[PDB]
Design a protein around this nucleic acid. Sequence first.
DNA 1: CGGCAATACTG
DNA 2: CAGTAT
DNA 3: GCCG
Length: 324
Amino acid sequence: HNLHITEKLEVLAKAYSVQGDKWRALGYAKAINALKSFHKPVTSYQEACSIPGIGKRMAEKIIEILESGHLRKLDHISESVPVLELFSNIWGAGTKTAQMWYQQGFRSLEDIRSQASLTTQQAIGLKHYSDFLERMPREEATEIEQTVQKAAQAFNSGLLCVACGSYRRGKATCGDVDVLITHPDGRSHRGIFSRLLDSLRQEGFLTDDLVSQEENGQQQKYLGVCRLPGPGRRHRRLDIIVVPYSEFACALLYFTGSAHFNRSMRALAKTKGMSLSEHALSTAVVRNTHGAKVGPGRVLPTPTEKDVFRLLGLPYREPAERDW
DNA sequence: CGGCAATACTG
DNA sequence: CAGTAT
DNA sequence: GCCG
Ligand SMILES: Cc1cn([C@H]2CC[C@@H](COP(=O)(O)OP(=O)(O)OP(=O)(O)O)O2)c(=O)[nH]c1=O
Ligand SMILES: [Mg+2]
Ligand code: NA
Ligand code: NA
């Protein structure tokens, strides 16, 4: 909700991110993800330090954007950054691949297309490069969720289908469509991916598969590309997860996010000797001196999302209140 | 000093 | 496993 | 980067 001083920081955060300095980029993310949820412009160095997420190092940079109106750090960002960002926006390519391609002399998508060795996923990502950078209106996301739900309830009307992610958080636009599928009887959700996916392929709704371990009967997620019928339609990313009714609440909480919200909640659980994943909320978890899990602990009953919050000693938050 | 979420595929 | 993804 |  404020301080365009962040637009200068966002640039650095993205630079460190594409370059692989993930932890540093996370630090900037939180500092920025904070300078927004805040209220008044920061006018003092000590007034910065006071904000949770901002430190002495960050404050000194927040003073050069006000006292000087410009951050000199941006003037020394590697010329490789724009290219690394270009490359890492290819679905399936991350910082490691982008850096490798850059080191190999590649500088444009034309270079990637004609000379780079692409994985199957990356070839799909490049083929839909522009489309994958666009967000769809939530109205279209509804159409996509309904298309999957109809095909699902087609072979089992008992299947519960819910659109999660940014859609459930009530955003105006959606990057992809995240559909969670389960079954109230807690058993019939058995290997339905085969039937659902082949049904969606049957009607030409699915165009490309990115992640889909279909040889496996334990498949949990399907990440792919779909496109609604008619003219003026673009390819949209689709992410579907089938979960046992037993893990419905945690799966719903997870898939709804946001990402930063999930990380915050999971971090809280850890401080309480507990653990949260899309599968369950556990207590009495044993972790070594490195926060690594050594002992599983006990799964706690979590029939509903509110239960998870309750068990964590947190007040319930509607999906729209989790848009962190 | 050293964690910063916890998990699922791919090859 | 590393890399990438949610 | 931040912070316990
Ligand atoms: C990326 C990521 C995501 N999640 C969860 C929580 C969100 C859902 C859906 O992710 P998505 O990227 O579609 O996000 P979404 O919120 O739907 O935003 P878009 O509208 O799709 O961009 O997955 C997570 O726990 N950790 C992560 O690192
Ligand atoms: Mg989404
Ligand atoms: Na990418
Ligand atoms: Na497959």
